[PDB]
């Protein structure tokens, strides 16, 4: 079949499956090929999820409690993965900026206060502020 081939190849080239899960999907395809569109679907669902587990797992600016709270939330509901990941990254930046703007060596306290205030006012420029801070810290380096 032509659906069989596209599903076979797609399942074969999903990056975030272990070997056993991939081989199980594929063996289910061999068993009843008429279930291709189902098998592929959940396989993609299983990929999109596990990828997520990795990314939040490797968000350096969150502690274990926050990370595995996001992981558990991802398990209790897989379908909102796209949301749970996004909001997690937005936390990461937010908590990173705060820390870096505090623990960064070469800023004077006027700049530091200004950054902490602009950060408390609007965290949506967290990534910007942090960036703007790092550059500043490097431009004023010894």
Author numbering: 36 to 177
What does the paper say about this structure?
Here, we propose a method for generating proteins and protein complexes with complicated shapes using fusions of alpha helices. To design amino acid sequences that can stabilize the alpha helical structure of the fusion sites, we superimposed one or two turns of terminal alpha helices of connecting proteins using a molecular graphics program. Then, the amino acid residues important for forming a fused helical structure were chosen from the two natural sequences in the superimposed region. Our method does not require complicated computer calculations for the design process and can be used for the assembly of artificial protein complexes with predictable and rigid structures.
To test this design strategy, we used a protein A domain as the repeating module and generated 3-, 4- and 5-module repeat proteins. All these repeat proteins were successfully produced in E. coli and could be crystallized. The twist and bending angles of the fused helices were very similar to those of the ideal helix. Interestingly, the protein A modules in the crystal structures, especially the last ones, exhibited significant structural variation, and close structural analysis demonstrated that this structural diversity was due not to the helix fusion but to the intrinsic flexibility of the protein A module.
